[PDB]
DNA sequence: CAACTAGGTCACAGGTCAG
DNA sequence: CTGACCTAGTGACCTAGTTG
């Protein structure tokens, strides 16, 4: 499976999407606090892949919130 | 390893930056180099300089060319704990 | 109870600012 | 400019916990 967010290999089904450890952790970290990720530099249309997933935080998150990641979409068990 | 040396200048490496084991100077140098319209003067020797700790700041152009020469890329960064 | 994941833990690019 | 010291994260791993 492929992280449905940065094409990096997926560790499991996370927050309602197949994802890699980095985007899972990066997701919980984004919702599990009231952080104000700095505005976007490159006009809010940032690509997100395994090689540049950490460059824009607003865009990696916004992307997370588009492939349908969410806790109300969490799914425990086989 | 206990002590790995900077692949750009042989200084002690403070980690694995931009894709390779670099000292802390090249690290901040590479970053500063790619992070701007920073174009260094040419190299009075047609870029054949060598890099070591003592002369690593003499010819910039050649150091940067050394960084890129070894692999330093924003696309080669390995964040978080070293795997196994 | 096993298959399977949300969270915590903690091993690991960039801003500073003195030299 | 340069780079030793901070700050703010990043994600490999472990396992407490949840389903079916
Ligand atoms: Zn990912
Ligand atoms: Zn962006
Ligand atoms: Zn170095
Ligand atoms: Zn030179």
């Amino acid at each position: 499976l492929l992280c449905k967010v940065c094409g990096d290999v997926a560790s499991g089904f996370h927050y309602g999407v197949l994802a890699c450890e980095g985007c899972k952790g990066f997701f919980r970290r984004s919702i599990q606090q009231n952080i104000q990720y700095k505005r976007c530099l490159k006009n809010e249309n940032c690509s997100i892949v395994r090689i540049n997933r950490n460059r824009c935080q607003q865009c990696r998150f916004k992307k997370c919130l588009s492939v349908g990641m969410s806790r109300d979409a969490v799914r425990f068990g086989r």
Side-chain angles (χ1 to χ4, degrees), chain A:
Chain A
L1 306 183
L2 296 189
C3 172
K4 204 273 188 174
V5 179
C6 79
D8 185 345
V9 174
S11 59
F13 189 73
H14 293 104
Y15 298 101
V17 161
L18 313 143
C20 65
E21 295 297 326
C23 296
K24 176 184 61 178
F26 171 78
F27 187 54
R28 65 127 177 302
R29 197 182 304 147
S30 312
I31 58 183
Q32 202 271 110
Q33 52 190 299
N34 248 186
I35 30 182
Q36 297 179 117
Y37 287 158
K38 48 175 293 184
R39 307 190 186 197
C40 176
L41 299 177
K42 323 192 81 300
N43 63 246
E44 291 159 43
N45 296 8
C46 288
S47 164
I48 299 291
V49 199
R50 183 191 176 181
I51 237 57
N52 72 125
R53 73 198 170 199
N54 303 289
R55 307 187 182 167
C56 186
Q57 300 177 314
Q58 200 185 24
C59 291
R60 176 189 199 167
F61 186 45
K62 198 207 68 304
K63 180 68 178 299
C64 275
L65 306 187
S66 292
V67 297
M69 280 186 107
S70 63
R71 61 169 59 277
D72 80 42
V74 176
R75 172 189 108 190
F76 297 86
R78 177 175 158 176

